[model samples]
Target: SIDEYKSQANESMANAWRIITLPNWTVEKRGTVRGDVVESRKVEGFGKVYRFTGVVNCPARFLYEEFKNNLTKLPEWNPTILKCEIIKEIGDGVDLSYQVTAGGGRGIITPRDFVILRRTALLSREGRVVDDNPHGYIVSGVSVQVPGYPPLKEMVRGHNKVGCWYLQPRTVQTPGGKIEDQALFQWLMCCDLKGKIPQFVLDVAFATVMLDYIVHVRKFVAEAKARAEI
Candidate 1:
């Protein structure tokens, strides 16, 4: 099946690793870790993506806030998802989660969601690496041990990991009629991402959002300015 495509990986890890940078494709890790995670940065590559899916069982608004407010509270439901908190704050972006999985087949897998904040070419070009901040706070290269799992043991991997999600508003038919929150946008980061973003792709996505905000901001300012002149 599609798994055959995996056989076509480029020998150069960096070149093959570049696939995650594409929004159309996502990287997932699976299988047990063999020898010590080779310190060879040239080959091992970045962290794997975790696949996330669930039934909200709550109203859309309530779920939305849960996603926004409880960015660090996955242990409430996901037994394997341990320790998700902000590491570094970059505008709207933040590094989150020192994670582990237990009572399951998978081992320590950390999928930290980095919401696209400032999408400049220079910023997106940063690849997967530890970014030690000026405050002596390192932003990456941390490991989480799963409960009841072997110490010093990092095994199992998976792809298509989900970082988070904002349940998109929905439309439902009722006796009253179709009710919906059309203005609300709900989504979740399918995977926690760091450096290794394609600047051009991110730049386009950023510009699109910026242009949209400008339209609204301009409308607000114009109304205010006109009122003052009157």
Candidate 2:
């Protein structure tokens, strides 16, 4: 039912808020590659949502702007994303989008694709005040199988896909009057893919892929700032 889909989306968003605000997390660790703490939680029958928190030495505005730009720039920084496009605009910063990912395992396993409705927004802490002197931003998406959307014959549609990003801004003052901006960035993704890999191996792969992706993003953020300075 249409109403069911709406309610599901709302519940998923509420879960995202709970994730960002809840304390006493169960899975928390600092990554060796980037020193970012990766936290996670599991929801029976819905899989797991992993969150990574790190301070990026870039202005929150810049990072948010980069994400808002059409996803053409995605492949530039994240190689795994082979392609991305908006299929439909659902209004209010929500849209139906498509993506093809080839990084996990292209030839060994069929490429993975997604059909999703994504919503982007800015809000205050606690998520209670919307558009009221916002301190952070969020990008949340959930998968939906839309008829006639058509998947590539070479790829398979991923299952139960959901993801969210919440970026909170911080400011630092330097003696040189140089203002350094940072963001407490958090990322969460939950999904099940059609694959033969064992659960343990899949867990390792998921963590590895996430770390790799964020590391690239960190480099790109620095690169973007450096290029601006030159």
Candidate 3:
């Protein structure tokens, strides 16, 4: 049901926006990792989740289109992503994808993979004002099982309790009263990479993954913005 998935898309996106905006955050943990913020907190039902947020010097729409259109090409940009394939397109805004993340712990971690129900949408929760903004986008994914994927047999299949990336427009006005575009990016992920490895080691690997991922995103944004200027 395309309409059903439409609602799913909205819910996923709304949840992404809601969690980041809601209060009652516990345990500040470490702050300002390479100018970005990382916080670990346990949601009542979502378990331990890590959130990464920062201001991106790119248009939210640009990044959203780049990611949504290049789903299969993720491996080319993200270092940790080994491969991504679209298993099934569930509806207009929903699909099932399989992706592999590179191993960490110096091969002790081997590799991890996911069969995800992924959805994306242009969502606005701020009444009509929200609908008026054209630069925001949301991508959300959750893990599920599906038949016929031999790679799962080789790598540990991870549970994506809930994964959401919200690329939001941060509006700013200059003294001249003109708006400048700078996007705000937030990611909330409650994931379980099932294995018998050390927790500290997994923590180390995930931090690196987040930092490296931002580097890739910033590189793409800088290049794309440059193209627009020329």
Candidate 4:
């Protein structure tokens, strides 16, 4: 039922929140090509997970809108996420999606897939209090074993222990009433692309993806703004 799926999403979101907010993280890499930070920590159950923190120059809600209903269009902008298709809508705030990731290592790392339950929320509607919340948006997802949709024949079935993107809104009021809208974006990526690949290989790929993914997002948002004239 949707209730069950929603609960699972909530639990996943909470777990991601705990890890990203932890004080003790093994800082893995910092100041990358995109100037973003990626850290690692041995999370319970899912060992050696990564957390990505960065900033996006846009309103929180505007940035979040890029993902809320833009799942199917992900591959159009983000090439790494080869395909993202919605399988089922469980309820008002939750649904199931099947995503295929582009292979790495010159196709040595065959494409991986995920059947994830996703939940999106606006802080105010969810009745959640946040620090100086300005159009805050939280989107969370975790892999689930669905009855009808099993692993695809061509790809390894990956597992997402938990993942969440928290976008907090901020605005800088410059001189002459010029306002710069921005958001503090944080993403928790805890997933295992199940395969025989070496651990270090996956780790390096994940960290590199951390920066590459945001570069796509920034471009996506900027292009929209350019066209929208918003």
Candidate 5:
């Protein structure tokens, strides 16, 4: 069964590759706080396999550290994500996680819960070894419908998902006669809710929710960095 999951993960990675390499990407600008730009694109035939790229005035290592260390505090920073808990660590940096998310709205929009596998890997900059002075890491995950876990009745089970986060670092100048490392972040995901909600509604709501979610993450990181300087 674990092998089956690994096979699925490999397939998901390939899908991520295909989606990213697609040439036709429509660019749209959504204003975010502090002038942090959020640009998104959708390729035809992918059906909401959305691509998003942005720059954060925070170091790539800091961003990764927040994700690695601040699991319990996630809900405080991200409103749409209600909760996250690690179900199991299946080795090789792959772990099964349970996450609850606030969907579009009440009544028409049911909240979603997912049991997914997640893994992260680092890519080395040119002429440098992996994990040596790094730029950023890749975060990837896929949803799985497991038996008898997350038996919550109020939430709908999510499925048919694959997603990745790619972050590359750069140097940035601050006003305090200071310079710091920043990150250029790229993210992509393709998923289906498998619910009674209208397809059209799901498409629009998902796109909006995703962009908002990333902006929240950026704000959280920025605030964290500002606090550290104080």
Candidate 6:
């Protein structure tokens, strides 16, 4: 059935994604305030981003504390990142960078020798306490991970040549309220390209994979209510 295939396609998008969370968050806003703290908005040939929220039994302080002062541990939380390390620190914020390994090893190769800039800081109401307390640190940055395409040789050899993954804690919002502790994934597919796939075929394939990625993220949020135990 189309619905069954659609369901599976949507799942692939959600499974492979990266996570972005803040440290020392506040209880009032829940986790609503999120922006480009590291790198500015970016989208290459094709890219999409999905966000979700939720109320965990744990306090915001705990999560924030855990994430605070640790800007070099993205690979642990982000599924897309193969490695993340701080290149140099400039004042309060450090210049962070990352290297993304091709999911299929060496298929879609992109440019490299890039860098990601990051900044870290906290906010407090000075003397406010409890309900009056106002404090939280903002963490955000752009990591470097040049995407690449495999040579014509690999494609000719008939290989997966394409892959993607997502890390838990990535957010995705939907009609089912906010959700956290989830992963979102997107990728370019081979079968979708058809036999003797051309450049246009590859373009469509890439778009199809990414669009499915966003949809899959939405699915998680939509299904979160029913699969709360899963």
Better-scoring candidate (TM-score), 1 or 2: 2
Clashes of each: 15, 0, 0, 0, 0, 33
- Against the hidden reference, what TM-scores do the models get? 0.31, 0.83, 0.79, 0.86, 0.78, 0.32
Q: All models: lDDT? A: 0.29, 0.69, 0.69, 0.77, 0.66, 0.32
Which lDDT tens digits does candidate 6 get at residues 1-230? Answer: 33433333223222212122212321211122232111111123233222223233223333333343543554454444455555544453333444442232123322222243333333242411123223433333332232352233432212221122211233456566855443322121222222553553344333333332333334433453366533
RMSD of 1: 18.6
TM-score, structure 1 vs. true: 0.31
Distance (Å) between predicted and true CA of 66, model 3? Answer: 1.5
Sort all candidates by lDDT, best to worst. Answer: 4, 2, 3, 5, 6, 1
Better of 4 and 5 by TM-score: 4
- 1-230: candidate 5 lDDT, tens digit per residue: 78677666656655654565457665444545443333335655555566667787787776765665555578998998898988776655566778887866233446778787766556554312265566456666788877768557776777647687767778888899788888887777676656466755655565566677787887797788779931
User: Tens-digit lDDT track for model 1 on 76-111?
Assistant: 554444445543333322222334433321211232
Best by TM-score: 4
Model 6, position 17, has a per-residue lDDT of: 21
Models, CA RMSD each: 18.6, 3.2, 3.8, 3.2, 3.7, 16.3
* Best-to-worst TM-score order: 4, 2, 3, 5, 6, 1
Candidate 6, superposed: residue stretches over 4 Å from native: 1-50, 76-79, 99-114, 123-136, 143-230
Q: Which 10 residues in a row give candidate 2 its minimum summed lDDT?
A: 102-111
Highest-lDDT candidate: 4
Error of 6 at 183 (Å): 17
Give the worst 10-residue stretch by lDDT in candidate 3. Answer: 126-135
Model 4 weakest 10-residue run by lDDT: 125-134
